[PDB]
Amino acid sequence: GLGFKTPREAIEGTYIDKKCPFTGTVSIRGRIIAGTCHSAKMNRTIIVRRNYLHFVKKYQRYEKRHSNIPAHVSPCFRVKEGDHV
Amino acid sequence: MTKRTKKAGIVGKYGTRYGASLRKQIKKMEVSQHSKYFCEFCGKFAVKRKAVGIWGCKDCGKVKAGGAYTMNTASAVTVRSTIRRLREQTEA
Amino acid sequence: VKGNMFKNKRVLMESIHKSKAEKAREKTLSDQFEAKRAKSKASRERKIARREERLAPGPERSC
Amino acid sequence: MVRVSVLNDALKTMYNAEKRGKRQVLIRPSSKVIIKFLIVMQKHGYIGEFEFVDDHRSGKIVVELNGRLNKCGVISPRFDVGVKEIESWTARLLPSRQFGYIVLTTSAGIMDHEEARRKNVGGKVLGFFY
Amino acid sequence: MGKTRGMGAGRKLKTHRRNQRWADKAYKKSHLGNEWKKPFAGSSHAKGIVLEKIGIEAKQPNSAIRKCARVQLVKNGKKIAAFVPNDGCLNFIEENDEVLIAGFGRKGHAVGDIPGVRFKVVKVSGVSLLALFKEKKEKPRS
RNA sequence: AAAAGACUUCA
RNA sequence: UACCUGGUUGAUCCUGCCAGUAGUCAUAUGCUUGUCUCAAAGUUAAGCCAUGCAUGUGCAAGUAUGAACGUGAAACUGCGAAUGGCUCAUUAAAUCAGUUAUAGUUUGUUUGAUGGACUCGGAUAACCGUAGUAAUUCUAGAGCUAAUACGUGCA
RNA sequence: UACCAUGGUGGUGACGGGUGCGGAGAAUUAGGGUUCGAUUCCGGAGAGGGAGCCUGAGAAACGGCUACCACAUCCAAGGAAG
RNA sequence: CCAAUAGCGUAUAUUUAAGUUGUUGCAGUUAAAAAGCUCGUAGUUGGACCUUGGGCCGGGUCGGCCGGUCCGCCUCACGGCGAGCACCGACCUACUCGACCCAUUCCGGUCCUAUUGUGUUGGCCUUCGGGAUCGGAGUAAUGGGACAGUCGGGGGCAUUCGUAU
RNA sequence: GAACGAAAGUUGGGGGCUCGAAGACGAUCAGAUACCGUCCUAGUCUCAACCAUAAACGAUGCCGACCAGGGAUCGGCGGAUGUUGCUUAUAGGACUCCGCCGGCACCUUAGAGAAAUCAAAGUCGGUUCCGGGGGGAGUAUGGUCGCAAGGCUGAAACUUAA
RNA sequence: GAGAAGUCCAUUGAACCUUAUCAUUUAGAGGAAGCAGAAGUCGUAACAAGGUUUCCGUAGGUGAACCUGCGGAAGGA
RNA sequence: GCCCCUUCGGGGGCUCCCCGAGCACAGUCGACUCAGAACUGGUACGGACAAGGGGAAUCCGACUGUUUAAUUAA
């Protein structure tokens, strides 16, 4: 079982021609900085697993923490998004 | 650049051996010929050097006289313009 | 290949097949988008029909 | 950006002007500020003329005082909305000493500081009407 | 002011700048130097004074244990110092006088003033008047 | 519409 | 409370900095300390080290017991010596913090759970008797002897 | 560790360099920040430098070993020894 | 004479002052300072009006060790120490509300699911919801650029004139 | 990131008059390599190609909102109004003549600015760059661009009570 | 049945020497004159329209302060 | 042809090649060579043989080149 989620967008996944099942997810977060009180954003990108397939770049998904199948692939593509019908 | 600091074009042809005032000029004056050029007739990036002052377009094949190093230059341009102006005043 | 990013006979293949999977997965997300447009059309085209449907009763109720 | 400052400046400039009233274009948030102004009797009233179809709106805001002194002794922006400089229910740093009010688009809506304080809400200060 | 305080990806840029501009002094201090340093010196010399007026103070050059040679001022009236000795230096700042980055404050072998009062812990002596100087001289010899 | 230069230090 | 005042000047106002002044440290110079009372106590060498010493238990953990007189006690086995202490050299790191994950995993001992008085033999230290590189440190040729430490039969 | 794929990361600072333990906290200053991060509490780390191992539930061990090197020591100076 | 007084200054370190790293809390016309100017992004921000969600917010309840800090009480003659009690803590984790601001319904065909009432168990059939394929009826889908006009010493090319030298 | 970017320099080639560094000289004068005079080459110029800087200034970044008027200047625009003046059914080019819109500048305000001044340099909002007491220093060193010149980038030791 | 000294292959995998280079502390081949003290010489530039108005980019070149050619500016007549 | 359902009477159910999209290998013909590992020897593993000794300071000429055919190559 999982695992908490982060939202992110699919930065890449296609280098190149075929890549093995997985995608890159850029995640953005911010926190309000003490002092100046302007928020700072700091990215992070995580390599999500794609056993399901069908995950293209520019795709918002949900990452959940999962067992590592290698190392720095810790997460899995819990779900995606879209519309009707 | 690629693996080039200062810059070069030719400069390996000197090597370390040779020297500086002359090197400021000679990259510039062989390489400006080397620059693919668009033919005055066709427009494709064909024009290359046959000999000193001789230039030829690979696609259409039109061969032209021009400067030693360069396809053209200020002097030729000025001479053509003056001639055209003179013919136009006479026609008047 | 002219960039010479890949050196050898196996080693070419995995990058091409990774890309077949990415671009294809792009292509199933794309068919999923393309189906989604046709479905939203379908839903719309039902609303527009039954906009015109709701219009025709208004005269009926009147007389 | 946001209008906000223009409305504020227009008002105080108007007061100095001893102008009967001022006018400009408006929203819900800049009607909202105006309403708070009316509620705490800063201005006599405000109207939004031509409000239905035309390309714009306007807002005839009437200034209060006329005579002697002007009601709005001082009004200044601090920091507009979208935002940060942000206050908490409790953090409320301020001017006057309760003589004046600070329009704060809270969470809840745009209300005055006292209401927000009660309201148990923080938000983003619009300005310090004195 | 530029931004003032917003969100979407933006505080960080003029955090960087402020450190970089920094006047004062970085990474505490030592390009010579600080702390209590005991330089054993054998140069007694006299040096001049700053652009405003003249004098000629008597000075003694000292070479530090922490490898530096500079000229140091001696305070108090009169003085003697001998074989080496070890005279301890405060390294206080004038805000400037030529080549004179430090002064050697009273410390061990650095003596104090002709038997006085007036005062005694600036410009300094011994028990009542003197008593300390007599003992002081003995130390280095044996 | 001008021949022509200097003028120790601290007060 | 915090707040300032001296120096650019003939004199002025503004920019601007130096300096005094205020508080404070895990610190030094120190002159000078009648006093009760508690407290810091090598960011220098993670340099190098002499001397004593920093871990012990059999009146129900264990069968046995030379020597000492049921009582104490030396070795073996069980529990312990890894806790603790101290220093920040390494050190910007899922190192650490805070939140979760952990059926993806350990927990002896204990607190707690679950299982459960026939006959027995085996050799061994202390004690001993001498010893080798031998002054040695050290341990063995070696007599003797005891095992809920071992090996078994097993509803 | 095989085989297959050639990658993954960085103009939101990756990789790299320097830095006269990290947190709980300390000192300031009206507030803000600045500063400081330590002896103590807490977690981590190392025991002259470095790797490996037995033992034991738990050690990769300051008060155990192995053993190269660094450095003192004992010597009836063979060898031990920290 | 006197400030302080069993302490004092001196230096080092550090901070305030010093709005002199300015978030609160400043300049860039002549004071350090406006980028020669543009084309454009990643990056700060956003004119009006209606509606939906809900990342930015209230209440929360967890943790936020002790020590220290603050209040006040006693205890060693006093005090500081120390004891005992109280009060405050950012922020971060659950939960729920909250929003100002940053096509569908119905009805039937076609496919699946169907404990049941049964000692017991096997096979079988129809109707309704969910799930799948559907067919029909009521009911959506909304500052830049453009055209006419004007100046000009806008740029490039050709023509052409003259004083003077 | 990228583009343009005076002049002067640089480089090939054409032209090369006036001009004109340097240089050649005369006077000055104590010295003149100086001003002042004569002479004089690259240059000035053209076409090709570099550089990336100027007191690139409006000493005023660039975006938008508001907040005083007054004389007319150019463009158009709404004209009003007739007349020159054309032409001549008539109309604008302008002209008597007001208004709007954009720029301009001066003249020129009251709250600001240190004052000088500004009417934008205002009243306070957006945004980038960038500043750091002076001198050392727009310099060292390394990297980057340039044929080179040099440019961009950019410190300290130290020194001074400014 | 247990299995001592022991010898070999493979692996984790010490320390001296082999690199080659970078860093720190240093000294230092030889060399340039940036600031400074007052007690120096040279000229008199800038400073008043500074006796040729200042400053400036740019090259040339001069004992030097500097000069001037070209173009630009008014912080200039 | 197989499952199948049944109250036993009798019934119900179900291609090859090449393409788009989700979640190593086998057979013919089989070679030079780059790396990697293990044991273990030898004194030495480029085992022979061939096959650069290296570093700094100074002078000259910028460099490649040419020259006393038969005592000068600078």
GROMACS .gro file of N, CA and C (backbone and C1' of nucleotides) in nm, chain G residues 48-49, chain H residues 48-51 66-73 81-82, chain K residues 14-17:
model
  140
  571C        P    1   4.844   1.213   1.784
  571C      O5'    2   4.945   1.202   1.905
  571C      C5'    3   5.085   1.214   1.875
  571C      C4'    4   5.167   1.231   2.003
  571C      C3'    5   5.138   1.128   2.113
  571C      O3'    6   5.204   1.004   2.082
  571C      C1'    7   5.140   1.337   2.216
  572C        P    8   5.163   0.871   2.160
  572C      O5'    9   5.203   0.898   2.311
  572C      C5'   10   5.131   0.824   2.412
  572C      C4'   11   5.176   0.872   2.550
  572C      C3'   12   5.092   0.813   2.665
  572C      O3'   13   5.122   0.675   2.695
  572C      C1'   14   5.117   1.042   2.697
  726G        P   15   4.281   0.657   2.002
  726G      O5'   16   4.399   0.724   1.920
  726G      C5'   17   4.407   0.866   1.907
  726G      C4'   18   4.483   0.906   1.780
  726G      C3'   19   4.433   0.855   1.643
  726G      O3'   20   4.323   0.933   1.595
  726G      C1'   21   4.656   0.819   1.649
  727G        P   22   4.234   0.873   1.478
  727G      O5'   23   4.329   0.889   1.355
  727G      C5'   24   4.320   0.991   1.256
  727G      C4'   25   4.374   0.936   1.124
  727G      C3'   26   4.287   0.826   1.061
  727G      O3'   27   4.178   0.886   0.991
  727G      C1'   28   4.509   0.749   1.058
  728G        P   29   4.037   0.813   0.992
  728G      O5'   30   4.063   0.682   0.907
  728G      C5'   31   4.072   0.695   0.764
  728G      C4'   32   4.108   0.561   0.699
  728G      C3'   33   4.012   0.444   0.724
  728G      O3'   34   3.898   0.455   0.637
  728G      C1'   35   4.231   0.368   0.758
  729A        P   36   3.763   0.383   0.678
  729A      O5'   37   3.789   0.230   0.647
  729A      C5'   38   3.771   0.182   0.512
  729A      C4'   39   3.827   0.040   0.496
  729A      C3'   40   3.747  -0.075   0.561
  729A      O3'   41   3.636  -0.110   0.478
  729A      C1'   42   3.984  -0.107   0.606
  744U        P   43   4.580  -0.955   1.796
  744U      O5'   44   4.557  -0.945   1.641
  744U      C5'   45   4.520  -1.063   1.568
  744U      C4'   46   4.470  -1.022   1.430
  744U      C3'   47   4.566  -0.937   1.347
  744U      O3'   48   4.662  -1.022   1.283
  744U      C1'   49   4.355  -0.838   1.332
  745A        P   50   4.815  -1.019   1.325
  745A      O5'   51   4.867  -0.892   1.247
  745A      C5'   52   4.864  -0.892   1.103
  745A      C4'   53   4.837  -0.751   1.053
  745A      C3'   54   4.937  -0.643   1.094
  745A      O3'   55   5.056  -0.656   1.014
  745A      C1'   56   4.710  -0.559   1.122
  746C        P   57   5.182  -0.566   1.049
  746C      O5'   58   5.172  -0.450   0.943
  746C      C5'   59   5.194  -0.478   0.804
  746C      C4'   60   5.144  -0.359   0.720
  746C      C3'   61   5.200  -0.222   0.757
  746C      O3'   62   5.329  -0.203   0.695
  746C      C1'   63   4.964  -0.190   0.734
  747C        P   64   5.444  -0.148   0.789
  747C      O5'   65   5.400  -0.002   0.813
  747C      C5'   66   5.416   0.093   0.708
  747C      C4'   67   5.335   0.217   0.732
  747C      C3'   68   5.373   0.308   0.850
  747C      O3'   69   5.481   0.399   0.823
  747C      C1'   70   5.146   0.285   0.863
  748A        P   71   5.565   0.444   0.949
  748A      O5'   72   5.476   0.546   1.027
  748A      C5'   73   5.465   0.685   0.979
  748A      C4'   74   5.391   0.767   1.082
  748A      C3'   75   5.472   0.762   1.215
  748A      O3'   76   5.571   0.859   1.206
  748A      C1'   77   5.253   0.708   1.255
  749C        P   78   5.718   0.826   1.257
  749C      O5'   79   5.702   0.826   1.415
  749C      C5'   80   5.677   0.951   1.481
  749C      C4'   81   5.618   0.925   1.620
  749C      C3'   82   5.682   0.821   1.713
  749C      O3'   83   5.810   0.856   1.767
  749C      C1'   84   5.458   0.783   1.729
  750A        P   85   5.907   0.732   1.803
  750A      O5'   86   5.904   0.725   1.960
  750A      C5'   87   5.914   0.839   2.045
  750A      C4'   88   5.833   0.818   2.174
  750A      C3'   89   5.874   0.707   2.272
  750A      O3'   90   5.999   0.737   2.335
  750A      C1'   91   5.624   0.718   2.258
  751U        P   92   6.078   0.628   2.421
  751U      O5'   93   5.969   0.524   2.470
  751U      C5'   94   5.922   0.535   2.606
  751U      C4'   95   5.849   0.406   2.651
  751U      C3'   96   5.946   0.293   2.673
  751U      O3'   97   6.012   0.314   2.798
  751U      C1'   98   5.782   0.203   2.557
  759A        P   99   5.183  -0.848   2.423
  759A      O5'  100   5.241  -0.702   2.446
  759A      C5'  101   5.250  -0.650   2.580
  759A      C4'  102   5.296  -0.504   2.580
  759A      C3'  103   5.207  -0.414   2.496
  759A      O3'  104   5.089  -0.385   2.568
  759A      C1'  105   5.425  -0.361   2.430
  760G        P  106   4.943  -0.412   2.513
  760G      O5'  107   4.887  -0.265   2.508
  760G      C5'  108   4.898  -0.180   2.623
  760G      C4'  109   4.929  -0.037   2.578
  760G      C3'  110   4.825   0.028   2.487
  760G      O3'  111   4.714   0.070   2.564
  760G      C1'  112   5.033   0.071   2.406
 1101A        P  113   4.162  -0.100  -0.014
 1101A      O5'  114   4.250  -0.118   0.117
 1101A      C5'  115   4.217  -0.039   0.233
 1101A      C4'  116   4.321  -0.052   0.346
 1101A      C3'  117   4.455   0.026   0.335
 1101A      O3'  118   4.434   0.165   0.360
 1101A      C1'  119   4.500  -0.199   0.405
 1102A        P  120   4.525   0.274   0.430
 1102A      O5'  121   4.676   0.234   0.398
 1102A      C5'  122   4.778   0.286   0.487
 1102A      C4'  123   4.917   0.223   0.462
 1102A      C3'  124   5.001   0.286   0.349
 1102A      O3'  125   5.078   0.397   0.398
 1102A      C1'  126   4.990   0.053   0.317
 1103C        P  127   5.130   0.511   0.298
 1103C      O5'  128   5.279   0.467   0.254
 1103C      C5'  129   5.402   0.439   0.320
 1103C      C4'  130   5.495   0.382   0.211
 1103C      C3'  131   5.514   0.445   0.070
 1103C      O3'  132   5.601   0.558   0.061
 1103C      C1'  133   5.487   0.210   0.030
 1104C        P  134   5.584   0.663  -0.060
 1104C      O5'  135   5.635   0.586  -0.186
 1104C      C5'  136   5.768   0.537  -0.210
 1104C      C4'  137   5.766   0.459  -0.342
 1104C      C3'  138   5.717   0.537  -0.469
 1104C      O3'  139   5.817   0.616  -0.530
 1104C      C1'  140   5.610   0.324  -0.460
   0.00000   0.00000   0.00000
